[PDB]
Chains A and B, each alone.
Chain A
Amino acid sequence: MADKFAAKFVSHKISRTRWRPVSASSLQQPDVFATGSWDNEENKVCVWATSDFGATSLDEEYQGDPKQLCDIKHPGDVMDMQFLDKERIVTGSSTGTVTIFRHHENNQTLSVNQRWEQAHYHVGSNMRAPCTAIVCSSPEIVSVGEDGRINCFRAESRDVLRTIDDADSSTMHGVTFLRTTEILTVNSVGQLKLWDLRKQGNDPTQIFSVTGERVPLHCVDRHPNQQHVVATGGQDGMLCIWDVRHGKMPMSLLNAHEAEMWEVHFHPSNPDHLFTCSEDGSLWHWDASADSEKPTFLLGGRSTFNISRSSIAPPNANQSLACAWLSTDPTKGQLEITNLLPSSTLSVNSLDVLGQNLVCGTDAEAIYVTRRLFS
């Protein structure tokens, strides 16, 4: 399984990795990705191509090293990165700046397309605060920061469209779109918060948390086809699954990592698969597809074994399309869990998955790429 990833040493730590979005009408595989750096004397955003040199040999091991196409200097650490579209990359900075870069494919260059230099700052001191996470729904951009603020931008608007001041009294670590006008945020006090961006107030619509001791939540992702299903990762390395319609508590809590979980992502086109990365140097693939064997109604077979776990579930919810991630049946939810990287990397800070391709970035100053995720 170690033979699935091409490793590229790049001589700087990688904070973020994202695939360039492909057209849904193209049979084209993603061949271009972007990376952000952190904790370097000069931080940068880089664009990379995976090499396709035409191995018409079904039997040669893939040694296609990623090639840097171009780069641009980034003020402070790249705290988060997303593609807004095929040509535009959005970044959150440790300086509190949100920046849109444009990639010019014709000359392989990056340029600043737009910038908000005071997106994040502490009220009263006007001191800059880190922009910790960003999410894109073209042309809309949302950012969150250590100042506990939520900012809404449009890529063509020079001004911030809306700020939610004092949205949190704590650091927000992650943000995702629940819907076109609803976002989820995660914070340093172990809360998942739902926001309606059209609501004129600064209060969240809903607040979710674990029972008992609360640990920081670092990452959040939303199931692509099932908007009510959310995954989060936190400081204790735990994977939490939520139904944001059903209660304020997680539906499942899974031991995923031995240290801080940095990213969680559902597979965009095959959401029976989920991926997580951690400070412990691991990259996990979670497979929930084992229950997709259509119930072939046949035949009977007895046997008993007891193991105790407490769940109080009332016995009347219709068999509507059980999300594999919400299955509570210990006889049916066989999650297959695979570590994708060899043992002993430094921190795996970021992952992204598109089609058959996965990229991740590490504190080992290395990028890992596979193009045969499920082979």
Chain B
Amino acid sequence: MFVARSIAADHKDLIHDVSFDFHGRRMATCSSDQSVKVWDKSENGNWHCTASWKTHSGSVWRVTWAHPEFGQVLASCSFDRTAAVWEEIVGESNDKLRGQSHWVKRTTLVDSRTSVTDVKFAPKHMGLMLATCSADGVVRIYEAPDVMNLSQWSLQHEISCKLSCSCISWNPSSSRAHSPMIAVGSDDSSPNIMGKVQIYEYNENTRKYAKAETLMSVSDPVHDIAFAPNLGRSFHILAVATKDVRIFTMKPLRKELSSSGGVTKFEIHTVAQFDNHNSQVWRVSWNITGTVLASSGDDGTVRLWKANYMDNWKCIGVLKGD
């Protein structure tokens, strides 16, 4: 029996995203009220708002934690066309300012021409990198060259998707046999545009991200995308939130030694398609092992999906808020 717990988020408007820290002891929430809030889990399992500040001049669409090796770093993105990076200064602020002051805005990334719809830190083995996607159809990848100086972020890569970008996912695979990959989703409502999920692979020879694949079977608007954590699989798994939940496996085809600079070709299979929300699916998230998928939709439910030992995916749980 899953126990739902209400948290009085005290946001003045709609909450767009919730992100846990790497240890699952802190969470960040972001809202149309232009604010980010941080919440800490006490030993009794209660949640307490430990920081609340205005971050942006428009609705905050996403919030993400960096890996704890880079310290206590948050990124937020917004309708105001910016992404902001925040660092928590852990220090003795004398016992009178426990309300709001330990999060410092280190930078504002302003290169995007329209709404920045999603923001994701890269896997830690790539360094302190931040991807942003914008409705202008561009993914921008920034790097902080010095973790001690989070005020400086260099634009390393610009990826033209040629579609309005809605969501991004880094492939978390630490395998040196796999070039760094990014999946990009599009919320474009045009029925004439097939392939609203695009996969980009970093090509070492060109020092650029090149389009490896396009999921032509995904013609519906994409609201969220997530690569599953790769704990020793010879293939990738991608979840896609659209009118339904889709799960794709992507097996890299062995590079025939004859294409001296090609992107990796993938053998792609749809291993699951679930219409059980009977409505649009807004979010998809993998467990840390990449074995259980959570999805949320307009049906007001969170659904849990898991493969059995025959690779048959099933709904294993439904959580409903009261």
**In the complex, are there CB atoms of A and B closer than 8 Å?**
yes
Residue positions of A touching B, CB distance < 8 A: 41-43, 121-122, 124-127
| Contact status B92-A41, CB under 8 Å | no
Residues from chain B with a CB closer than 8 A to the CB of A122 are 91-92
A42 — nearest CB in chain B belongs to which residue?
B43
A117 — nearest CB in chain B belongs to which residue?
B95
| Contact status A127-B91, CB under 8 Å | yes
Residues from chain A with a CB closer than 8 A to the CB of B8 are none
Question: Which 9 A-B residue pairs are closest in the complex by CB-CB distance?
Answer: A126-B92, A125-B91, A125-B92, A41-B43, A127-B91, A127-B90, A127-B92, A42-B43, A121-B92
B45 — nearest CB in chain A belongs to which residue?
A41
* Residue B94 lies at the interface, judged by CB distance under 8 Å to chain A: yes
* Residue B93 lies at the interface, judged by CB distance under 8 Å to chain A: yes
Cβ < 8 Å to A, chain B residues 298-315: none
Cβ < 8 Å to A, chain B residues 26-61: 43-45
Please encode chain B, from 89 to 107, with 1 for each CB lying within 8 Å of some chain A CB and 0 for all others. 1111111000000000000
| Contact status A125-B45, CB under 8 Å | no
| Contact status B44-A41, CB under 8 Å | yes
Residues from chain B with a CB closer than 8 A to the CB of A42 are 43-44
- A124 touches which of B43, B92, B95 (Cβ 8 Å): B92
Residues from chain A with a CB closer than 8 A to the CB of B95 are 126
Residues from chain A with a CB closer than 8 A to the CB of B90 are 125, 127
CA distance A191 to B146 in the complex (A): 33
Please encode chain B, from 275 to 303, with 1 for each CB lying within 8 Å of some chain A CB and 0 for all others. 00000000000000000000000000000
Residues from chain B with a CB closer than 8 A to the CB of A127 are 90-92
User: Nearest chain B CB to A228's CB is how many angstroms away?
Assistant: 40
User: Nearest chain B CB to A184's CB is how many angstroms away?
Assistant: 29
Residues from chain B with a CB closer than 8 A to the CB of A121 are 92
CA distance A43 to B93 in the complex (A): 26
Residues from chain A with a CB closer than 8 A to the CB of B45 are 41
CA distance A223 to B90 in the complex (A): 41
CA distance A32 to B127 in the complex (A): 54
5 cross-chain CB contacts under 8 A: A41-B44, A41-B45, A122-B91, A124-B92, A126-B93
User: Nearest chain A CB to B88's CB is how many angstroms away?
Assistant: 11
A121 — nearest CB in chain B belongs to which residue?
B92
User: Nearest chain B CB to A255's CB is how many angstroms away?
Assistant: 35
| Contact status A124-B44, CB under 8 Å | no
User: Nearest chain B CB to A20's CB is how many angstroms away?
Assistant: 28
Residues from chain B with a CB closer than 8 A to the CB of A41 are 43-45
A76 — nearest CB in chain B belongs to which residue?
B43
